[PDB]
């Protein structure tokens, strides 16, 4: 079935689940040709696959070479995503394989179901949550490793840093989605909020700054204000 906010706590029970977001798999710049036409050039992309209970992000880098000589790339991208997620599941020990995969875009359902035929007991589901995972490429260290890749590559991160040492997975996911929604809504201002104190640093193995508990409360407030400010600007409220 489809996921939503009635059964929202279920995301953090002990059944393993994986969100898959394909919005950054096929990425282009749109530029003008010598004959005056407009032409695309692909740039590196990524599959965003996240277990929300543990913070484990499996970031598969999609190198531009996979598109060479291919047609209908937006369609192919969904099948490429499905192929790689299926491969990820097969590479995991059985006790680590998900019981559900939740796709952020309904167009991924048939490609993933077809690639996952060998796993009849893994449920493939859409969700009715509007998740901001498209803004994953606003996280500086994720963007950097994607744009630097010269070959297909799988990179691993805990997208929650060390937060689970102090907060629940429900709370961590809420913090993540708030940060990413802010980055999606006003990227440059959201980055300013995060980097405005140069004495709070990002650990070498972390994605986010080493905020204390009280500093996170302040940051989260500033992020909620950013989002509300942009809503008011957009709708003249």
């Amino acid at each position: 079935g489809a996921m939503n906010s009635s059964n929202y706590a279920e995301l953090f029970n002990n059944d393993i689940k994986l969100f898959v977001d394909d919005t950054n798999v096929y990425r282009v710049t749109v530029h003008k040709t010598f004959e005056g036409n407009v032409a695309t050039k692909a740039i590196n992309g990524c599959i965003f696959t996240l277990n929300p209970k543990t913070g484990h992000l499996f970031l598969k880098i999609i190198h531009t070479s996979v598109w060479a000589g291919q047609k209908r790339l937006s369609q192919l991208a969904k099948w490429k995503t499905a192929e790689e997620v299926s491969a990820l599941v097969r590479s995991l020990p059985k006790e680590e394989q998900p019981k559900q995969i939740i796709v952020t875009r309904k167009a991924m359902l048939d490609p993933l179901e077809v690639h996952m035929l060998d796993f009849p007991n893994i449920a493939i589901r859409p969700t009715e949550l509007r998740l901001p995972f498209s803004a994953a490429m606003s996280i500086d260290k994720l963007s950097d490793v994607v744009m630097k890749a010269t070959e297909p590559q799988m990179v691993l991160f805990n997208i929650y840093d060390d937060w689970l040492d102090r907060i629940s997975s429900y709370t961590a996911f809420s913090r993540l989605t708030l940060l990413l929604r802010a980055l999606k809504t006003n990227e440059e201002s959201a980055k300013m909020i995060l980097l405005s104190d140069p004495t709070i640093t990002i650990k070498s193995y972390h994605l986010w700054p080493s905020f204390t508990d009280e500093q996170w409360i302040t940051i989260e407030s500033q992020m909620r204000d950013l989002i509300l400010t942009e809503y008011g600007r957009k709708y003249n409220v």
Partner: protein, 300 residues
């Protein structure tokens, strides 16, 4: 010509014989159907006046024996039986005619509709889909589920249609996931035609049988099968040319025969828009497309 006599007609009923229908009143002096063109296949079907729930009937080949109908007051339905005493049967059907309490099968000579609907339908293949080996005829009704449907609860009383499932390992070669899902030609040609049906005649025969069970009994699983078998052909980029041209004819006569007021429940909009306007064979169903647009534009 053959005869299907009735012992009596104790309950008011609508009786179908092939594409025709007539009514019988309660305890009307009715003793069956005469003048039936021997064919290769026939169907006699029933819908009771006092309870239109359960349509039901019997597929039969007049060449495989002498068949009659007798009402069963315990089970409450008209049952087909076979008469093994031929001289007894000739004695009835050479008289009951001599009494004139039978309706005449009314075949207009211009009308080739029944073999256009059943050319590929065979009784030996029917008896594999409807498994009741002790009888030479096959009972179908409105409620019978299909083997496939049972996999998603009395297997004896099921319709054993060939399972077609576009999102199954049978349909999709490992390593060819996108290819085989977007172009079902492998599944059609290697798996279904070469592997299971053996030739297109057997394929069209099940397709035709499924259509007729959907139309005559309102059997939902049959409708699913009919549509699935159309969609498999239309979703294949590579189909023999004889098969496409023959499919257009087969579908045209099915659409032509369909009751006009039954289109909301016997035609799946998604499937038909895909086959006529989006599929590999959108340009190969010229006559079907023309009858569909001029008879059922609202669906499209």
């Amino acid at each position: 010509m053959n005869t299907v006599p009735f012992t009596s007609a104790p309950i008011e009923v609508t009786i179908g014989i092939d594409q025709y229908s007539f009514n019988v009143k309660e305890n009307q002096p009715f003793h069956g159907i005469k003048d039936i063109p021997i064919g290769h296949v026939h169907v006699i079907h029933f819908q009771h006046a006092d309870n239109s729930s359960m349509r039901y009937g019997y597929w039969f080949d007049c060449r495989m024996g002498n068949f009659y109908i007798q009402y069963d007051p315990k089970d409450g339905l008209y049952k087909m039986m076979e008469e093994r005493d031929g001289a007894k049967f000739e004695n009835i059907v050479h008289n009951f005619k001599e009494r004139q309490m039978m309706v005449s099968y009314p075949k207009i000579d211009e009308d080739d509709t029944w073999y256009n609907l059943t050319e590929f339908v065979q009784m030996d293949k029917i008896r594999k889909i409807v498994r009741k080996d002790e009888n030479q005829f096959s009972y179908v009704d409105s409620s019978m589920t299909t083997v496939q449907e049972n996999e998603l609860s009395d297997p004896a009383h099921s319709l054993n249609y060939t399972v077609i499932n576009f999102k199954s390992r049978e349909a999709i070669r490992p390593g060819h996931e996108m290819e085989d899902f977007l172009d079902k030609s492998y599944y059609l040609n290697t798996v279904m035609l070469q592997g299971i049906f053996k030739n297109s005649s057997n394929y069209f025969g099940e397709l035709q049988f499924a259509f007729l069970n959907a139309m005559f009994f309102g059997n939902y699983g049959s409708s699913l099968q009919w549509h699935a078998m159309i969609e498999l052909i239309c979703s294949s980029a590579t189909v023999p040319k004889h098969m496409l041209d023959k499919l257009d004819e087969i579908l045209y006569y099915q659409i032509k025969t369909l009751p006009e007021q039954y289109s909301d429940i016997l035609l799946n909009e998604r499937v038909w828009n895909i086959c006529l306007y989006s599929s590999f064979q959108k340009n190969s169903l010229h006559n079907t497309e023309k009858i569909m647009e001029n008879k059922y534009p609202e669906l499209l």
